Amino acid sequence: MELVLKDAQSALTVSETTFGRDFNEALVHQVVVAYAAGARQGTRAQKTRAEVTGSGKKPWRQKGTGRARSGSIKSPIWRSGGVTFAARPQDHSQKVNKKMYRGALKSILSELVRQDRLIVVEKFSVEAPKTKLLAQKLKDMALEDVLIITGELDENLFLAARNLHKVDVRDATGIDPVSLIAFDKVVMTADAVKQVEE
Amino acid sequence: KIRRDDEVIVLTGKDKGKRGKVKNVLSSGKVIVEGINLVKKHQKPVPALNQPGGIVEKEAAIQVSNVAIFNAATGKADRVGFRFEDGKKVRFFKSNSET
Amino acid sequence: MKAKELREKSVEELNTELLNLLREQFNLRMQAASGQLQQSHLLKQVRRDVARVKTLLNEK
RNA sequence: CGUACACGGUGGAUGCCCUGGCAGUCAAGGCGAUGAAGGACGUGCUAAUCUGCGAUAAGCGUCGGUAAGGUGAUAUGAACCGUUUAACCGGCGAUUUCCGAAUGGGGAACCCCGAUCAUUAUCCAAAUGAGGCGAACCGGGGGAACUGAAACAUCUAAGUACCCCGAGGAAAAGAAAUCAACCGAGAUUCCCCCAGUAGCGGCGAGCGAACGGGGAGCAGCCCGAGCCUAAUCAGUGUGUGUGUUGUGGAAGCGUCUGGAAAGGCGCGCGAUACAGGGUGACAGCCCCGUACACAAUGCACAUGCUGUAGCUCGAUGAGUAGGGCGGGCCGUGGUACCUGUCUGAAUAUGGGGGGACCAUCCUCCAAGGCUAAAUACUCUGACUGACCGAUAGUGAACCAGUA
Numbered sequence: 001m002e003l004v005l006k007d008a009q010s011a012l013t014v015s016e017t018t019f020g021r022d023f024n025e026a027l028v029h030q031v032v033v034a035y036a037a038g039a040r041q042g043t044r045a046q047k048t049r050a051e052v053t054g055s056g057k058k059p060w061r062q063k064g065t066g067r068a069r070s071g072s073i074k075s076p077i078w079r080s081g082g083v084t085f086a087a088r089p090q091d092h093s094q095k096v097n098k099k100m101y102r103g104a105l106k107s108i109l110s111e112l113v114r115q116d117r118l119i120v121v122e123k124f125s126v127e128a129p130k131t132k133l134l135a136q137k138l139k140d141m142a143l144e145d146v147l148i149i150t151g152e153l154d155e156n157l158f159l160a161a162r163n164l165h166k167v168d169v170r171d172a173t174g175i176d177p178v179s180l181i182a183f184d185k186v187v188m189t190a191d192a193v194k195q196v197e198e
Numbered sequence: 199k200i201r202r203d204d205e206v207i208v209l210t211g212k213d214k215g216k217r218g219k220v221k222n223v224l225s226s227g228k229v230i231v232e233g234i235n236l237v238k239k240h241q242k243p244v245p246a247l248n249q250p251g252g253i254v255e256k257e258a259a260i261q262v263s264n265v266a267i268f269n270a271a272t273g274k275a276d277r278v279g280f281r282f283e284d285g286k287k288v289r290f291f292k293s294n295s296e297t
Numbered sequence: 298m299k300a301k302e303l304r305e306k307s308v309e310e311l312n313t314e315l316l317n318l319l320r321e322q323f324n325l326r327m328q329a330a331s332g333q334l335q336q337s338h339l340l341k342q343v344r345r346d347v348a349r350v351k352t353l354l355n356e357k
Numbered sequence: 358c359g360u361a362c363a364c365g366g367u368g369g370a371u372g373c374c375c376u377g378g379c380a381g382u383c384a385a386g387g388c389g390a391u392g393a394a395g396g397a398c399g400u401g402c403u404a405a406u407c408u409g410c411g412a413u414a415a416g417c418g419u420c421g422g423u424a425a426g427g428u429g430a431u432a433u434g435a436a437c438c439g440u441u442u443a444a445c446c447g448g449c450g451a452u453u454u455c456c457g458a459a460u461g462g463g464g465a466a467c468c469c470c471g472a473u474c475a476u477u478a479u480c481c482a483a484a485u486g487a488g489g490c491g492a493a494c495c496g497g498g499g500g501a502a503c504u505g506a507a508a509c510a511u512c513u514a515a516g517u518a519c520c521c522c523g524a525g526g527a528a529a530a531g532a533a534a535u536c537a538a539c540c541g542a543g544a545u546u547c548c549c550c551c552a553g554u555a556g557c558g559g560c561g562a563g564c565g566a567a568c569g570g571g572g573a574g575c576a577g578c579c580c581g582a583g584c585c586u587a588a589u590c591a592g593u594g595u596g597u598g599u600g601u602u603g604u605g606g607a608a609g610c611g612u613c614u615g616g617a618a619a620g621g622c623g624c625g626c627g628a629u630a631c632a633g634g635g636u637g638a639c640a641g642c643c644c645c646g647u648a649c650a651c652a653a654u655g656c657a658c659a660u661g662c663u664g665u666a667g668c669u670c671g672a673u674g675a676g677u678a679g680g681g682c683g684g685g686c687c688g689u690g691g692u693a694c695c696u697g698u699c700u701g702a703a704u705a706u707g708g709g710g711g712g713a714c715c716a717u718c719c720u721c722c723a724a725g726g727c728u729a730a731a732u733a734c735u736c737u738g739a740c741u742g743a744c745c746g747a748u749a750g751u752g753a754a755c756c757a758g759u760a
Contacts, residue, residue: 037743041381049547049732053495056522062493064517069527069734070493079380091380092743165631199606199645203425222426227636227644255432262644263617263636269643270608281424283442286605296607299441300418328402337402338437348413352451 003113005120005190008133010140014122017193019109027100027107028177028184034094035178042090045082050074101177108180109196118187119143125189126155131163143187150182154192172196200262205279206231210264219279221245221257229265230257268297298346303353311350318347 005014050068066074066081076084088095112118119141128134138144147165151158157169170179172188172195180186188196202220208231218233235245235258245258266275280297281287290296303311322343327335 033743040742041744043380051494051733052517053493053528054517055499055519056497057494058491059523060491060493061519063519065493067494067734069732070736071734072493073734159629163628163631167631201425224432253433261637268607272610283424284605290606293607301441336436340402345413345417348417348452351413352418355451 001113003120003193005122006141007122008124008128008137010137014120015190017120017190018113019193019197021106021110023110023114024104024107025184027104028111028181030094031101031104032176032178032181032183034096035176038090038093042093043080043083044090046074048073104177105180108177108184111181111184112186112188112193117185118146118149120193121153121187121189123154123189123191126153126158126191128158128160131160134161134164146185146187149185149187150179151187152179152192153189154195200229200265200267201280202229203280204267206260207266207275207278208234208260208264209266209275211260213258213260224257227262228257228259229262231260231265234258234260270295298349300349300353303350308354308357311354315347315350315354318343318350322347 001018002016003018004012004016007014048068050066050073052064052067053062054064055062065072065078071080072078073080075081112120121137125137128137135144138146143149147167149166151161151164151167152170152172152175153161154172156171161167162169166182168179168182170176172192175196200220200223202222205217205219206229208214208216213231213234216231216233218231221230221232223229230245235243236248238244238246245256246254247259266273266278268278268280269275280291298314303314306314321339325335325340325343328340
């Protein structure tokens with residue numbers, strides 16, 4: 001259909017855009033919890049170039065273990081080494097995929113074209129220097145409660161929004177599901193929508 | 199911050215009104231003001247609280263929350279004593295806002 | 298005595314001082330004698346004084 | 358005397374808390390013959406432990422910081438120190454017993470000297486070196502077995518476990534007698550891929566590359582003579598940035614509940630400052646602190662500069678190439694590499710290589726040498742954690758590696 005963009009005055013209408021991809025509310029809830037989990041530590045195992053010197057290391061008995069830098073790894077015997085059991089790649093994270101992670105990235109982009117969601121803002125948004133101006137454009141927008149949700153834009157990181165509640169600025173190029181939905185929710189700009197198309 | 203070199207003015211305890219110089223600051227957060235003391239058994243002006251006991255922790259134990267050093271605000275407290283060799287601290291002391 | 302005083306003293310003055318202080322510390326040994334007149338202050342200072350003069354003697 | 362309950366006890370679970378652990382990340386990284394690490398014994402007015410020092414003994418001196426209080430953990434008694442500004446936190450210097458590599462000799466810390474090997478050598482130890490330590494990384498040698506093959510002698514586990522020697526903060530390799538999709542690529546490692554392909558194998562089980570391509574990082578150069586000189590060598594001056602650590606400082610209303618609000622309700626404020634802690638109960642505006650800025654330390658590597666100094670001609674290294682005998686090792690197959698015994702060439706109008714041998718193309722030239730860069734732990738400092746919570750978590754949150 002047609003996604004009504006908004007001006008700085010949060011005008012009723014501007015241009016139009018949209019994303020086509022069967023949005024799945026089955027594709028906007030955990031993923032980033034997995035991001036929230038997986039992004040924080042995870043002892044892989046073999047992933048490391050650690051090697052063995054064999055005997056003759058230093059005048060002393062030093063078992064030829066999967067050593068590296070000055071401490072052993074990989075070997076289940078020493079910490080940070082690979083787990084000796086079965087079914088879990090990293091630490092306490094959710095095993096899984098490259099496609100669903102992306103499928104969620106596509107599906108999420110579609111979530112934007114939903115009534116009870118965000119709204120597209122004109123490019124001029126990136127101009128707003130002060131933060132207070134944003135709060136107003138968010139008030140008249142009737143989405144001030146979205147501060148509990150999140151925010152986004154295009155070109156460069158919005159210094160005026162970064163301050164705002166739970167705001168983790170991001171650019172249309174590099175946006176992760178987490179950004180597209182700091183909790184299956186978000187908000188973007190005109191140019192951003194165009195850039196994200198790719 | 200609070201310094202033993204600063205004169206304080208009680209405001210809540212039964213010692214409300216008394217003026218005096220701090221005698222020492224403890225890591226616990228209790229301050230002893232010179233003047234705020236108790237009367238021991240053999241009538242000895244030694245700081246402490248009140249209840250029967252044996253070996254004991256001196257000091258009347260005052261809370262910084264109810265004391266009154268400098269405190270820019272509409273209060274009943276008045277003047278308070280305060281280093282100087284710093285210079286920069288003199289400027290702050292000269293400002294009705296800092297110290 | 299302060300470092301300033303020892304430096305002003307002559308080579309001989311520092312020798313007569315050390316010998317005199319050594320004399321002090323010894324009469325101070327009355328600690329074991331359980332004397333009352335004793336005082337921990339000077340007792341601990343004599344060792345430093347004889348040390349100061351000794352160091353300055355080396356500085357010379 | 359049986360059962361349930363009640364009061365009290367025993368016991369210590371449970372709930373809550375935790376000055377501890379576990380895990381990850383960033384930074385930083387060597388110590389010693391001017392005699393270290395470690396240990397012993399001492400040292401505080403009283404002190405038994407721990408810590409700090411060491412007979413100038415939980416301390417002395419200087420500069421800077423800091424700040425008016427302080428005399429380590431212990432908040433005791435006595436006493437004392439500080440404004441001739443201490444306590445406390447940071448550079449440099451002085452002192453620095455004995456043993457210990459110790460090294461005169463002997464010795465379970467006690468008594469008398471450069472011991473031993475070696476180089477130079479005025480052959481006098483006279484001038485020097487080695488002899489130890491250090492968590493595990495790199496290199497060079499020696500080299501199993503349990504086990505798998507559901508037995509076992511190849512094979513497999515292993516080139517692992519273990520033994521010996523040695524370096525650095527990093528090591529090894531390396532400019533091609535190469536590759537061999539070509540009128541082509543073109544130093545060497547490493548990552549991905551090529552491949553689980555070619556190849557090996559009672560071809561049984563199993564074993565297992567490389568060329569190339571895509572990347573990271575890029576640098577190429579030295580030995581007989583002629584000539585001459587801006588590479589090198591010696592010395593001088595001597596940082597920026599960055600990284601780590603430390604440092605400067607003000608401010609609190611109304612109603613209700615309460616012993617006290619950091620509560621509930623009402624009103625208001627700051628924010629290049631939407632970390633944390635403290636304060637009589639969940640305080641961003643009560644105090645510290647956080648932006649901000651400053652200071653100290655390390656970095657010190659480099660750059661600049663003084664005197665040195667190009668370039669040219671010819672050749673290019675034999676018990677080797679290669680062959681035979683006997684072994685080791687390898688994915689190496691008649692086609693890997695190396696050791697030992699014997700034999701033994703030719704030379705660029707030559708020789709080697711392109712996975713079989715020998716005569717004819719293409720490529721490249723050994724038997725001499727050097728060479729920056731591309732990562733890897735966690736002792737140490739700091740940070741983080743949908744980790745655990747004191748029969749959990751490190752054996753150790755309590756004297757623990759103690760009793």
